[PDB]
Amino acid sequence: YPKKGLSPLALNTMDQFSSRLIPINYDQLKKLDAGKQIKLETTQVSGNF
Amino acid sequence: LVAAYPIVGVGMEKLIISTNEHASTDQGKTVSRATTNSKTESNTAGVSV
């Protein structure tokens, strides 16, 4: 999702409704400046049948 | 006689804080040039003996 002939999907928000963008404080920004990268993992997922 | 019954409990792994400040910096330049014009005119007297 989506199909293989298309671009990836974006996410930038964190509330119930899309507002109030995801913040990061100062020391982690200085850690992130030096070339580190973060890992994105799944924990659970739910759907219908 | 036994019960079909769950019990859950939690345990803290780590704790992060993040500070609130307001830093500000400023840098500036100044250049000036002025002129001055004047005039006087004096009168003197004197008596000796």
Question: Could you give the topology of this structure?
Answer:
This is part of a larger assembly, with two copies of chain A (49 residues).
Chain A: H1 26-33
Protein name (chain B): ADP-ribosyltransferase binding component
Describe this structure in words.
This is part of a larger assembly, with 2 copies of chain A (49 residues). The first copy, chain A, has one helix spanning 26-33. The first copy, chain A, is mainly alpha-helical and 49 residues long. Chain B: This is ADP-ribosyltransferase binding component. It is classed as transferase. The entry lists the keywords CDTb, Toxin, Binary, difficile, transferase. The entry is titled "CDTb Double Heptamer Short Form Modeled from Cryo-EM Map Reconstructed using C1 Symmetry".
Give the ordered list of helices and strands of chain A. Answer: H
Helical stretch count of chain A? 1
Biggest beta sheet summary of chain A: none
Shape of chain A: extended
Taking the alpha carbons of the first and last residues of chain A, their distance comes to 18 Å
Tally of DSSP β-strands of chain A: 0
This entry's quaternary arrangement is: part of a larger assembly
Radius of gyration of chain A: 15 Å
Structural class, judged by helices and strands of chain A?
Answer: mainly alpha
Proportion in β-strands of chain A: under 5%
Percent in helix of chain A: 10-25%
PDB class: transferase
Keywords: difficile, transferase
Entry title: CDTb Double Heptamer Short Form Modeled from Cryo-EM Map Reconstructed using C1 Symmetry
Chains A, B: ADP-ribosyltransferase binding component
